[PDB]
Design an enzyme around this catalytic site. Structure first.
Site, PDB file in Angstrom:
ATOM      1  NE  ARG A  73     -10.288  12.181   4.825  1.00 32.21           N
ATOM      2  CZ  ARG A  73      -9.920  10.896   4.862  1.00 32.21           C
ATOM      3  NH1 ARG A  73     -10.610   9.987   5.548  1.00 32.21           N
ATOM      4  NH2 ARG A  73      -8.838  10.516   4.187  1.00 32.21           N
ATOM      5  CG  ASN A  90      -1.947   1.138   1.156  1.00 32.81           C
ATOM      6  OD1 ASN A  90      -2.113   1.797   0.132  1.00 32.81           O
ATOM      7  ND2 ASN A  90      -2.650   1.348   2.261  1.00 32.81           N
TER       8      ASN A  90
HETATM    9  N1  B4P Z   1      -8.381  11.611  -0.312  1.00 31.80           N
HETATM   10  C1  B4P Z   1      -8.225  10.278  -0.525  1.00 31.80           C
HETATM   11  N2  B4P Z   1      -8.664   9.678  -1.665  1.00 31.80           N
HETATM   12  C2  B4P Z   1      -8.523   8.350  -1.877  1.00 31.80           C
HETATM   13  N3  B4P Z   1      -7.940   7.525  -0.977  1.00 31.80           N
HETATM   14  C3  B4P Z   1      -7.451   7.992   0.207  1.00 31.80           C
HETATM   15  C4  B4P Z   1      -7.573   9.426   0.507  1.00 31.80           C
HETATM   16  N4  B4P Z   1      -7.024   9.611   1.727  1.00 31.80           N
HETATM   17  C5  B4P Z   1      -6.579   8.408   2.177  1.00 31.80           C
HETATM   18  N5  B4P Z   1      -6.841   7.442   1.266  1.00 31.80           N
HETATM   19  C6  B4P Z   1      -6.506   5.990   1.351  1.00 31.80           C
HETATM   20  O1  B4P Z   1      -7.516   5.205   1.995  1.00 31.80           O
HETATM   21  C7  B4P Z   1      -6.905   4.077   2.633  1.00 31.80           C
HETATM   22  C8  B4P Z   1      -7.389   3.948   4.075  1.00 31.80           C
HETATM   23  O2  B4P Z   1      -7.133   5.160   4.793  1.00 31.80           O
HETATM   24  P1  B4P Z   1      -7.819   5.404   6.234  1.00 31.80           P
HETATM   25  O3  B4P Z   1      -9.315   5.292   6.063  1.00 31.80           O
HETATM   26  O4  B4P Z   1      -7.213   6.661   6.832  1.00 31.80           O
HETATM   27  O5  B4P Z   1      -7.312   4.094   7.033  1.00 31.80           O
HETATM   28  P2  B4P Z   1      -8.110   3.375   8.245  1.00 31.80           P
HETATM   29  O6  B4P Z   1      -9.034   2.311   7.711  1.00 31.80           O
HETATM   30  O7  B4P Z   1      -8.615   4.426   9.210  1.00 31.80           O
HETATM   31  O8  B4P Z   1      -6.887   2.575   8.946  1.00 31.80           O
HETATM   32  P3  B4P Z   1      -5.928   3.196  10.090  1.00 31.80           P
HETATM   33  O9  B4P Z   1      -4.933   2.096  10.414  1.00 31.80           O
HETATM   34  O10 B4P Z   1      -5.452   4.580   9.700  1.00 31.80           O
HETATM   35  O11 B4P Z   1      -6.923   3.377  11.355  1.00 31.80           O
HETATM   36  P4  B4P Z   1      -7.339   2.158  12.319  1.00 31.80           P
HETATM   37  O12 B4P Z   1      -8.350   1.252  11.649  1.00 31.80           O
HETATM   38  O13 B4P Z   1      -6.089   1.542  12.909  1.00 31.80           O
HETATM   39  O14 B4P Z   1      -8.069   2.985  13.493  1.00 31.80           O
HETATM   40  C9  B4P Z   1      -7.349   3.966  14.245  1.00 31.80           C
HETATM   41  C10 B4P Z   1      -8.266   4.484  15.338  1.00 31.80           C
HETATM   42  O15 B4P Z   1      -8.623   3.360  16.146  1.00 31.80           O
HETATM   43  C11 B4P Z   1      -8.581   3.796  17.503  1.00 31.80           C
HETATM   44  N6  B4P Z   1      -8.316   2.762  18.509  1.00 31.80           N
HETATM   45  C12 B4P Z   1      -7.339   1.830  18.484  1.00 31.80           C
HETATM   46  N7  B4P Z   1      -7.403   1.071  19.607  1.00 31.80           N
HETATM   47  C13 B4P Z   1      -8.419   1.542  20.361  1.00 31.80           C
HETATM   48  C14 B4P Z   1      -9.032   1.224  21.669  1.00 31.80           C
HETATM   49  N8  B4P Z   1      -8.554   0.205  22.423  1.00 31.80           N
HETATM   50  N9  B4P Z   1     -10.078   1.973  22.084  1.00 31.80           N
HETATM   51  C15 B4P Z   1     -10.574   2.988  21.354  1.00 31.80           C
HETATM   52  N10 B4P Z   1     -10.059   3.334  20.162  1.00 31.80           N
HETATM   53  C16 B4P Z   1      -9.011   2.661  19.630  1.00 31.80           C
HETATM   54  C17 B4P Z   1      -7.435   4.784  17.555  1.00 31.80           C
HETATM   55  O16 B4P Z   1      -7.534   5.596  18.731  1.00 31.80           O
HETATM   56  C18 B4P Z   1      -7.670   5.539  16.282  1.00 31.80           C
HETATM   57  O17 B4P Z   1      -8.626   6.560  16.594  1.00 31.80           O
HETATM   58  C19 B4P Z   1      -5.395   4.275   2.570  1.00 31.80           C
HETATM   59  O18 B4P Z   1      -4.809   3.350   1.653  1.00 31.80           O
HETATM   60  C20 B4P Z   1      -5.210   5.710   2.109  1.00 31.80           C
HETATM   61  O19 B4P Z   1      -4.053   5.881   1.280  1.00 31.80           O
END
Ligand code: B4P
Ligand code: B4P
Lengths: 394, 394
Positions: free
Chosen positions: A233, A8
């Site tokens: 966002r 990725n």
């Molecule tokens: N404009 C655009 N156009 C097209 N494509 C684009 C774009 N911008 C980005 N993209 C692409 O879209 C794809 C996905 O991007 P994102 O949408 O940003 O990725 P994600 O699914 O949020 O995964 P991430 O690892 O960042 O968050 P997580 O699920 O760990 O979750 C993290 C959260 O979980 C929470 N969390 C973790 N453990 C927790 C717990 N015990 N209790 C409560 N919260 C917890 C954390 O606090 C945190 O808040 C990427 O390939 C990117 O390149």
């Protein structure tokens, strides 16, 4: 023991995983970070953040390839999977990468200018470093190409759609696809006679209605800025409000684009952090804006889940996933309690279980709709697409 | 026989009605039109479009007052009700107009610059022409002031809310209020233990969730541009899409504001008309874009109705109102059929009845939620507020 290399390749990083073909378990993972910057570096398994100052996407991936050959993994790479941000209307499924696919990814790249060109940089680098290896493109938009016009059209003049390609695309498609498939097994549902809502709640967040195996509604738009409020966002925002703000503060669209994408959401309301764990603790400690950010976050999730259910004939299950959906006991409970109108009943002891418990039902038996947590695994989904495609005669 | 004079003094017109206090029936109605333009005119009951070239708001209302005195209605005007477009956070109920109320309407007028200053012009004109007559202000935002922060906040940085007053306000409040009250009688519901969704579907269109008598969610935003797709308004639109369009076509926010407000929605998709009757006939005749506009329109209504239900503990009724909600047999059926996930059952013979049948239930008995049509009457609601206030000692 063949492996799949999954890449990725984003605006500022390259996340990779190596998956065993037989078990789809991760053998190695890492991230080249600070890309196109003075101080770039490569950290495998969080083990030795090795410097790579002034390195292009092919340099970063060559670095990654070096670490694979040092572990004698290079010769077992049978497939490479690339995550692509945007497939426009041209991609409805994962494909073996050829000159045609590259041209077509380039054609739709104006829809996601930054991210798609990074993905193409990743493809060019991987094609250079592994030319005898089949490579596959998996698009975050493709699962949602089954949306009907009434569900993908904006209320803009027709010309914006037909000439410029302005429509809802939706994202997290690989996650929604994977998690919905897993749900049919967990919930003992007939894929072809089923209604699910999947809530992918991460730093990016989106809802998807899956009717009889097909995405029929999703909450992100032409871009990831539509739908749910997220870490940084805004989510849905009145265009009249945005235009009013422009006139009042003298900011431009490009200024407000940055505000809405990078300074808004949980960060923007709380004034503290985009991180839900930080905000959960802040609320615990009496922080009012942290509480308002979370309540707002939960409210907009409940509203989209219920709204997306309108595209189902019958609601069988609600599935939480992503970093927040998988780990936030509180957010899952507050959302479910905000959906009592759908007849949901939470089993709080099951909801309290940590994510180590994996694929798990969190609703009580009297619940009219089953609620579950299903950890997402986008790398595994990509690897499975690649493994199926590995059998093709091209 | 005292009467209430009700005034809605807009950017380009003044709509008025004279209502008998005893029965709330209309004795006279009309509209001064083409206001602040070279060719202004006054048409009462569509009877003799009398010219009034180059006339200010006080001239137009003086013209209207003339027609009242010629019919010996002037001496029976006991109350005047003014429809106000925007009450910000300052107004939660209808009020007797005083110097304070005028100052406060002026304070919140930046939130609705065009429309509120026309409303204030109407107040100044009426105060001049009827100084011994109690006058009352009824705000289209006030019903929605019971919304919780989580339901009214945008995901923008906190400063936009606290310093600039950027939040959801919602509109059609007078209609939603009136129709919800009528529903408690029609549906034999306890106001204090009830969940309704009201769909006000007109040229402007909005949804409102009413829990125990109080508005708890609504679909319009800071401005009328949010929520449902409408006759010429886009409704919900990805801000990323709008910013992408700006960069691609070289249009500004003010250009796109006009597109989104005046060239979008049913008009924009169909390329034919904002009028649903025109489009219904066009679809009947095989027009594909008319069909797409209507399906899109219906889809976004179903999605908001279901979404707004999330703010209820229990959904008892769905109420259709406005010009489309009252008269479109097809749109009501298509929306209800799009909400089978909520257990709705339509009685099609009851749904086929024209609006002459007034307040009417359109769901079959097995329906889990009652569906009804309740014709809105904003003038009657204003008159009733004024009549209650007529008893006050100020
Ligand atoms: N404009 C655009 N156009 C097209 N494509 C684009 C774009 N911008 C980005 N993209 C692409 O879209 C794809 C996905 O991007 P994102 O949408 O940003 O990725 P994600 O699914 O949020 O995964 P991430 O690892 O960042 O968050 P997580 O699920 O760990 O979750 C993290 C959260 O979980 C929470 N969390 C973790 N453990 C927790 C717990 N015990 N209790 C409560 N919260 C917890 C954390 O606090 C945190 O808040 C990427 O390939 C990117 O390149
Ligand atoms: N930016 C802003 N800020 C603040 N305030 C603002 C604002 N802009 C405007 N406002 C204010 O908001 C208030 C309400 O405005 P609107 O929201 O525009 O008014 P409305 O309720 O749509 O009433 P209208 O009479 O226009 O439409 P109708 O229900 O007849 O419905 C008409 C429709 O019904 C349809 N219809 C009629 N009969 C039909 C039939 N038999 N079958 C199908 N459709 C039918 C017609 O075809 C047509 O499509 C106004 O006071 C205005 O000043």
């Amino acid at each position: 023991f063949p492996v799949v290399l999954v890449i990725n390749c984003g605006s500022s990083s390259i996340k990779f995983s190596v998956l065993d073909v037989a078990t789809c378990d991760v053998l190695m993972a890492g991230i080249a970070d600070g890309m196109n910057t003075e101080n770039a570096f490569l950290s495998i398994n969080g083990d030795k953040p090795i410097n790579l100052a002034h390195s292009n996407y092919e340099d970063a991936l060559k670095a990654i390839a070096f670490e694979l050959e040092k572990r004698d993994l290079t010769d077992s790479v049978a497939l490479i999977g690339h995550r692509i941000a945007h497939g426009g209307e041209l991609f409805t499924q994962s494909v073996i990468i050829t000159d045609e696919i590259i041209d077509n990814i380039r054609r739709v790249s104006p829809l996601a200018p930054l991210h798609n060109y990074a993905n193409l940089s990743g493809i060019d680098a991987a094609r250079h470093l592994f030319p005898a290896v089949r490579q596959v493109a998996v698009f975050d938009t493709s699962f949602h190409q089954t949306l009907a016009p009434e569900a993908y059209l904006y209320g803009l003049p027709w010309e914006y759609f037909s000439s410029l390609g302005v429509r809802r695309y939706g994202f997290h498609g690989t996650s929604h696809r994977y998690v919905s498939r897993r749900a049919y097994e967990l919930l003992d549902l007939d894929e072809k006679d089923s209604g699910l809502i999947v809530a992918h709640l991460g730093n990016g967040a989106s809802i998807c209605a899956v009717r009889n195996g097909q995405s029929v509604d999703t909450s992100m738009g032409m871009t990831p800025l539509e739908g749910l409020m997220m870490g940084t966002r805004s989510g849905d925002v009145d265009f009249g409000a945005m235009a009013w703000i422009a006139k009042e503060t003298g900011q431009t669209l490009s200024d407000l684009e940055r505000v809405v994408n990078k300074e808004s959401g949980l960060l923007g309301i709380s004034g503290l952090s985009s991180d839900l764990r930080v905000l959960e603790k802040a609320w615990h400690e009496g922080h009012e804006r942290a509480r308002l950010a979370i309540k707002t976050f939960v409210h907009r999730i409940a509203r989209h889940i219920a709204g997306h259910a309108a595209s189902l004939h019958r609601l069988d299950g609600i599935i939480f996933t992503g970093g927040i959906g998988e780990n936030s006991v509180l957010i899952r409970q507050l959302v479910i309690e905000h959906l009592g109108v759908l007849g949901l009943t939470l089993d709080v002891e099951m909801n309290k279980q940590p994510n180590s418990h994996g694929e798990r039902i969190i609703s009580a038996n009297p619940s009219q709709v089953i609620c579950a947590v299903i950890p997402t695994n986008e790398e595994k989904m990509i690897a499975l697409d690649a493994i199926h495609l590995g059998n093709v005669k091209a």
